[PDB]
Design a protein around this nucleic acid. Sequence first.
DNA 1: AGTACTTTCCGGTCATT
RNA 2: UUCGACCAGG
DNA 3: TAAGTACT
Lengths: 112, 171, 554, 107, 270, 87, 177, 97
Amino acid sequence: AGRAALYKEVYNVIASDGSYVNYRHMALLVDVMTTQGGLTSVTRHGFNRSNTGALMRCSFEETVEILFEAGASAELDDCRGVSENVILGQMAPIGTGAFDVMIDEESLVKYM
Amino acid sequence: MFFIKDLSLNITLHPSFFGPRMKQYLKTKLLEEVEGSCTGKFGYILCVLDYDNIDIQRGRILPTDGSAEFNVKYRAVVFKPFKGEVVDGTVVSCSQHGFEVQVGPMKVFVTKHLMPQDLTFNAGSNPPSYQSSEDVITIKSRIRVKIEGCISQVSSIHAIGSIKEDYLGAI
Amino acid sequence: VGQQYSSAPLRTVKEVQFGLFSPEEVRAISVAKIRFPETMDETQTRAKIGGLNDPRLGSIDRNLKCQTCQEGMNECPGHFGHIDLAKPVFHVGFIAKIKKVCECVCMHCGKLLLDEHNELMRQALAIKDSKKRFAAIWTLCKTKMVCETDVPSEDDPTQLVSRGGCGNTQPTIRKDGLKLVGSWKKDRDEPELRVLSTEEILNIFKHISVKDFTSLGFNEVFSRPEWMILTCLPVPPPPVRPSISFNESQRGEDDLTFKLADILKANISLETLEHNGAPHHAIEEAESLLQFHVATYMDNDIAGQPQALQKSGRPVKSIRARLKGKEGRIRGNLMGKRVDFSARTVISGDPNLELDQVGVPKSIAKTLTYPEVVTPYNIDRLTQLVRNGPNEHPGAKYVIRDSGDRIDLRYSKRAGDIQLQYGWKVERHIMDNDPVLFNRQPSLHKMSMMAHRVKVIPYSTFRLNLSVTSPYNADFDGDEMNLHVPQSEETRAELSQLCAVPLQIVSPQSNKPCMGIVQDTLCGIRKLTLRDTFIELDQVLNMLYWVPDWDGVI
Amino acid sequence: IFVYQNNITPSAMKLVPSIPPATIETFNEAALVVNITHHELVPKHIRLSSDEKRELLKRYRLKESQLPRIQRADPVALYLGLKRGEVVKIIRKSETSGRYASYRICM
Amino acid sequence: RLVKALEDIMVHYDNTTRNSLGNVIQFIYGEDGMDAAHIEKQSLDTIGGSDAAFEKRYRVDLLNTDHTLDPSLLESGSEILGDLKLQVLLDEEYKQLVKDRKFLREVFVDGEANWPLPVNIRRIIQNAQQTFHIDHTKPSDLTIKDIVLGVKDLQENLLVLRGKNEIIQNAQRDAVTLFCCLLRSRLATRRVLQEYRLTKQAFDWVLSNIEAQFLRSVVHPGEMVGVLAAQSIGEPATQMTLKKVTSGVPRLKEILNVAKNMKTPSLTVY
Amino acid sequence: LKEKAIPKDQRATTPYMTKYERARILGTRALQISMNAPVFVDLEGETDPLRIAMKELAEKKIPLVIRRYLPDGSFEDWSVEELIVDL
Amino acid sequence: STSTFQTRRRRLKKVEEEENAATLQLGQEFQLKQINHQGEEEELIALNLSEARLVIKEALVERRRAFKRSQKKTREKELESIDVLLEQTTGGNNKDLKNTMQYLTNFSRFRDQETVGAVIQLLKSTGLHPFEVAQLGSLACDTADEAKTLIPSLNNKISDDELERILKELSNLETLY
Amino acid sequence: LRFGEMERDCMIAHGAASFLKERLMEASDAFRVHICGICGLMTVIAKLNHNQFECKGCDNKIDIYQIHIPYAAKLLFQELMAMNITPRLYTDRSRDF
DNA sequence: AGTACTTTCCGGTCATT
RNA sequence: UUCGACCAGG
DNA sequence: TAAGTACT
Ligand SMILES: [Mg+2]
Ligand SMILES: [Zn+2]
Ligand SMILES: [Zn+2]
Ligand SMILES: [Zn+2]
């Protein structure tokens, strides 16, 4: 029900202006903010502390402070993070790259 | 000693050859870059067996150029000598420091002082050799060596072997 | 990218294993002793001394050599060097832990202060999360200050069980600058304050148990606590601390290249004291200096004021500083860079372009280029562009052959010549209908960046259609805009199939279209409506002719 | 279940987790004057069999951690009395599709 | 912040909303799997209106001279009146439209019946209309079975999730429910024949379209929803140029900060 | 790894091609075509690659395969041939 | 290069590279327990000369064959017969294979895929390790000593008499020339 | 001109995957380094001529990959190393999931 | 328990180093 | 390149 | 600017 409020509140903020946002969005955010357990704040105090990789959280408000304790605690990064790959110069698993493409030699013969 | 290990290799094929008989080209190239290869972890790659049932699997297209990359899984015949391994080959070159036996695709060398004493080295000979009381070792003479040590290098493998133990020498 | 073929297979990074350097590794890796603190001048003679930068490390002066690694400058990334310290030093950023760890283990024997025996501990040994064990463990043993030798097991509080030994009281600890000091309580009374020598700490750690590492947020292979203390120092190579030469007979050394210069100096001076007139503790007055530099070199925005200003009063860019958010590596160099194939000018409306179009000025279209690959389909057209030159509009300015070599179309004694080769690339001019990404910052919309159709036009302005105005959120009161040019056949596709303006017409942020009709067109589309309003032949005819898809039926 | 009035002694409560399997819970009167589950906002939850759970996971291909969570002390978590590991199914209404199925494991 | 906080969130091929850990954040993007883009404010006619009007509109009784479909509408009009095997489907329908009523009134208490929903049905028929030059004069040619049984066979295909099991195929029903309600609302026997004289042709068409059109309005596994939603909120946040509560911008800040001491605290007790 | 390869049956994902998919299939294909790869359709006089691809893609004569990874790592395999192309 | 069916998780400290000796301790890449492509396990594959001469020939041959389905669209006597099979299905610049067949074809000890068969069926009742079960097949041995000495990995694995019988049945199957 | 953070976020939204990379690499940084298949570092002494590769210390010469990454990144890394922190670059996942 | 401290997106000038 | 300032603009 | 932590 907390969620329900957190949403209701955020929604009212956008409504006061006479604007409109399709649920889903405010929902999504209001959710990301909740799932974890309670009220996880959209700030260096909250979300940017979760289990997410290092290189990611690394790019927002704590950087070095964060990287330091990453090697100290020998963290391992999945490189599933958008940011992760942006930093490596690789194609991020995002839309266009949320999947792979292959030449199926088989079908490559019936075509002639 | 000669083995039949299961290997695999990745070839990056350029869209160019994304033809009809691609399967063909791949295999072909597989061969270009293997039969004749050499590693310490595999030694001499000599021949790809079962040319026909070579697995190609689906290759995936890289992502900046159409080049595709298939993990060609094959099986072949290998040979990588070992220290303490006993093999017999044919001598090739022979000097004042010993002769070199050729056990297969490899060349094993034997030091003058890594043979017996009753075996000296005759210089003014033609072709050059090593004489004994009853034995005579030269070019074509077949020897059986005990590979004392192995040294990997570039695209080949050498090793020093002895004939000082028993049941070792000519035949 | 990089150029020159490498028989080295190529792959993508999949994982990033964060760790800490082990003094032994730092050594193995290094290719430079790094004994002298000077830069070069073999007695003014120009070159580099086997001392600092290039005692085998990277290079400068446009000269191959990188330990024969040749390649020279571009291609030879740096090759770390090291520099054996005199005495162990903290790691400016780790102190925090190093300290918080001691409060978790007692010296002399060096082992935990709470075994499976204490129950409140059990619960703190099940939590799987390095960050959380060590954040609960610590909270539990930061209080107890007596290395218990006998404790009441899972039975009677009467019966006492034994484990490790040496009750040697545990001193509480506090942080003063770059050192750790603690008091040992003596009963009978009054404290006993002494400075914990690194040399000491380091030791207590080396002995910490293997399972003890782990229990506390660490890793036997990648990060043993004992490494938070610097024994050997890795020496970033030129490319990390490059120079800046004003031709010759001058200087240009980088900030970093100095702190090492100091660290190095302040190291030697120490050494030359432990093998000479060593007034015992008139040294720890010069060992704090190394702990200082080798600290600041990494971080220089501490609480203990002394900024370590460099002669002139300029703060000194610490490594940390280089990564610090915004304007910095991570956020300014990696998460967002400057790029090529881009242009920006002033935008102005033009009621004559289809919505999805964008007016690009010849000036630019002749500057920006798209690499096309010589194919039998184009050969002809391409060769014509090449001949045309890089001055006439529909043309090109660079032909590049398989042989990884660029023909500069504006100079080449063969400009006019050249027969293309299927497989060659011909960077040509941006042509009418090359998809591009147009945009107006601040970008806070999918729409702040859309793909348009290039339409080469005269005069100097990006001329965008009016209705696509409100999505970028732009006026023409002098507003500027950015244009990026795709580069690979598959890149374009991504713009044209997902970023094209016609697509952005209906927006998800509000499940309603996001572009409409404004100003004249709107205002006028009301007037032109009204019952009151009629139009006569002569004109109704032209109006028809204007709608391009008029079925020709008055 | 033990219902206290103004409070229990810290000497007392430290005797609940000393006789497993069995379990005990502490509730204040003033907190049970009203049932929270009856609140407009709070949607109805539901416990899940260690069968229904080992399923949920298998059908989404989830590991225990990737699942949304509920506090061990959460008002509703108590009303139903979950246990570190039990999963609750939250079914609420939705302005996008009548009903929505959500899951909350427990920490 | 809003962004950095949701980058990693996208819809994975299973139609779940997760991040880089794979921690489910939404089991079906937006609790319905529909892409924001394909949605319009439609009206769930079944909600508002007097209990009286409701009957006059959706109720069909084949056992009554005044509550049956006048044979001026359906071709097989006269030969139906009374049939008892039909008045079972004809009543199954109604009992449902009624379940519907009560359901919506339990979700949208306000009474507001206009909501965002994929597939604009209003128009889809409007086209059906002037596409088949349908004359409001002569009688249809739909069996009563034709209608009711096809509408039921429609909901069967509005697939959002696909899975080959209960848990999954159960969610299916869920993330569609609302829509169907709107579907049954506009494809109820009386309506289908009295309000929009559809022919067998038109109807079979109107159905086909709804199916296809729906299947398009699903969300694409690939959509980086997070970033999207982020902006979608933080965008109309900049356009905020400024009864005595805390207000907009500062408040939103207050909210994302999860601050303990809010300027305005209030609390409405009914 | 094959435990991570889902059978052609038991298949679950969308029977239709995602907009990103096609977008990439076309791009990708275009690229290759522009690389002098072999074209499997009569170029009705077409000469622009992404154009050709758009054709190959409508005669569903593209030798590619979209491998859809799942959150847990297991993937599903589909062919441009199978995949329905609405849009 | 060319990977080998077994991703050994190398966690940084690569230091234990044991020695190589007829202590049957072959590089990790040749444990008795290696992995087959099908994902199954399988005993190492030990080829004794002349048994190898046949595997190679058998494929170098059936290659020439499938090299023509697609084409449409006595000691000194075998030196010549093989040289051709190469100059048809080999790389020609595989000077190793050339030399591998000479050697392999000269020191070979059997000509029939039947003889080589029995050799195998025989030694394969020993319970011996593949590498020995090779040397025994490609090295002339008259005594248990000449044997248990040029293959010191045998020493305690088989009575002298037994090993001696086997050696008898070898020179007995040893095809002439 | 600059393709700052915001501009990225947009492409990410668009799902314009490849494009994003293209701005980030090909049209900017893009660099090619070598690694030790063992100790995920830049150590590698690539002579890219006599094909020699080495990496004494982890002592290789056989297991070596080549990767493409934004030069800025290489730096990020080298800067991190000078701070005595190790960022490992591995070409294969071993943690599954 | 209080007070201070630290932590919007995007050309050319001058001055110093 | 950098620090600083200023500016200048959307 | 204004808020939030961590710190003295
Ligand atoms: Mg303005
Ligand atoms: Zn170099
Ligand atoms: Zn102790
Ligand atoms: Zn290495």
